[PDB]
Write a protein that binds this ligand. Structure first.
Ligand SMILES: [Zn+2]
Ligand SMILES: [Zn+2]
Ligand SMILES: [Zn+2]
Ligand SMILES: [Zn+2]
Lengths: 216, 215, 216, 215
């Protein structure tokens, strides 16, 4: 597949869409603001729209390597603040996936260059959960790590000034930590769902405990 | 609601597992993406539907108004991994009409934290003030989102990642595309670059072509 | 000079200070919050305390390569937000200096590595003022660039959400753009001094015009 | 006021120009710094007075609570320029008692933007919760600022810049120091590292020594 094919594919896709339903492009402008923010991995193994059946227009999306919410990453924080304060999304979903190159590189630590600094935030998670990871078979640790990573990023998201303020003011925002295996594309709820500070803390410990009981 | 998403996913997964189990086997079999797509978080039309590309062919970054800020380590980490590790052959920066970030940069409401990110668009707006003044006021927001794409391509080409890749003769082409939400038709802004010569010549070619389109 | 000498110097400096004036360390804790934020270069050719005669405790300091205030640099923005909203500094001084390695590297563009990305923000200034720079002798351009850089960083600082909010709420905060030549250590006011949005804009154009008239 | 600073500077400059004009000539003559100092924006005692180092010997970075965040490109750019370009021989991370950033991380007032930066200290606080629980509550803030320094040294050693410099055999020593504002005496936290072995062994040595000091 070359660039000339993409431009041609696009021309055909739009022409077939305009002739069958000319209203499709009209409606989208009229369609309400997105209700969901999706924070996922740049790998985008299965697009969020196909995973969830959500329409374009219902989702606002951020993608970065290994779907991180770093405390001081102004790129992700700016997407989150615009989504929560301006679009007033009702749900934020952080979704991780199995076979993630970023997760694998964080553990294997090849000398990849610049990206290694970003991946040190995953190495932090690997260290935080070293006791839990040591209780389970070595061949399961990478799978547990991508799920632990999601739960930690939800925990970071909930602790951000954006979410603390939104929740303290009683805004309706639910944050979710989901994951899927590439072997089935089935979304699994990691049970860290939070609607306020209480459910953020309770949900975080509930999700870690459930993962611990699943692998040990 | 959230139960509907889980319901849609369950039925979608079971349907694919039953009709073509090889689909997920083919997914598990690693075939590196050849394209990096840098687009807007608005994601008005997903990149896969716009281009007809299969998900395994794309590596994606999305941020507000599809910026490539010189010092944004989130985007730079995606670009460095894509170029040096995945060895993508193409990087496409795609902008779109009716972008909330572009509109907020011009209108300047007091939105909060996001206003700092949007000051990088205000920088571009000031840069092209003379060009924008030569066209009707009602056309300026449309010109601005296209000018924004071209400036982000220019930043991408100037990054250490792209300068190093081109100096070592790696095959990487960077593109600046845009689409109107009125038709979803991709338009090449003609800033396409494969090296330092085409980066500079392409940038001025794209600005001149936009100027001739609107003036 | 080795590390063992620094530890020994420190032991002697403190002992001579404690025996002569034991109250020195007591007073500092009691001393009021700093009234000034100094944003300067990591080169720190002449320390801010010696340049201004300010005491330790009167200054809150940030230093980075070429004294930048990037719109999206959360390190500098976090220092500024804490200084303005928490310490309630009355003055913010951005100070540049001649013979700055970062400024020179931005123009000469050696392949230095990671730092080149940070320096592209200086290359942006060089491009913005290309017409002005082209009107003056080539040997003067690097000197004009470090002063233009200061004025642009003041302009960025004033446009940040932190300063816009502080000023809109009537908080007393003055921002200054200063520079000194290493040949005399004399602070020069670049005349971009701003106490509100009006003086930010008027001051910026006043400083650029004055620099233009100085070099052309 | 501001006029006093300009007045102090004028008299200081004229005084040096008259008494020793060679001072500024020696300043203009480039002699690269051998030390990078990463300290807190509080700058309670300037690094030059604490150590007796001359300004030309130091390259300085200051941020709230002297952090080395894995993905902070401001600090990473200072470190990369210092290590690869200036080829500093020593990097000193210095923390201090009574740090406003450390106190705010624990007390968690709703300060605004800065709270996000401080979550990196809250990460460290949680990491050492068991150790902190073994000492009196009134000692915990003092232990925390020292633990913070050691963790930032650990981050610095793990950065691509330091891993690359040590792998190529460059002579760079990283230090974790702290001083109490009660005496200004520099204390070596004993996490000193020159390579990957001493980084790991030094980190555990420093934590164990702090544990034995407070428990
Ligand atoms: Zn991934
Ligand atoms: Zn957009
Ligand atoms: Zn400098
Ligand atoms: Zn401090």
């Amino acid at each position: 597949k070359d660039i000339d094919t993409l431009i041609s594919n696009n021309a055909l896709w739009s022409k077939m869409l305009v002739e069958e339903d000319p209203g499709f492009f009209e409606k989208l402008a009229q369609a309400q603001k997105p209700r969901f923010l999706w924070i996922g991995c740049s790998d985008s193994r299965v697009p969020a729209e196909r995973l969830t059946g959500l329409e374009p227009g219902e989702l606002f999306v951020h993608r970065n390597v290994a779907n991180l919410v770093i405390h001081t990453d102004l790129n992700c924080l700016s997407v989150v603040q615009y989504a929560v304060d301006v679009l007033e999304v009702e749900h934020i979903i952080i979704c991780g996936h199995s076979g993630c190159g970023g997760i694998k590189a964080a553990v294997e630590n090849p000398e990849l260059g610049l990206i290694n600094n970003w991946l040190l935030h995953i190495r932090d998670i690997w260290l935080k959960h070293s006791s839990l990871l040591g209780k389970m078979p070595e061949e399961q640790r990478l799978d547990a790590l991508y799920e632990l990573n999601v739960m930690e990023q939800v925990y970071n998201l909930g602790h951000s000034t954006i979410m603390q303020s939104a929740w303290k003011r009683g805004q309706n925002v639910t944050i979710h930590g989901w994951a899927y295996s590439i072997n089935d594309g089935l979304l699994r709820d990691l049970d860290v769902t939070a609607t306020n500070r209480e459910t953020l803390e309770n949900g975080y410990h509930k999700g870690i405990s459930a993962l611990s009981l699943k692998y040990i």
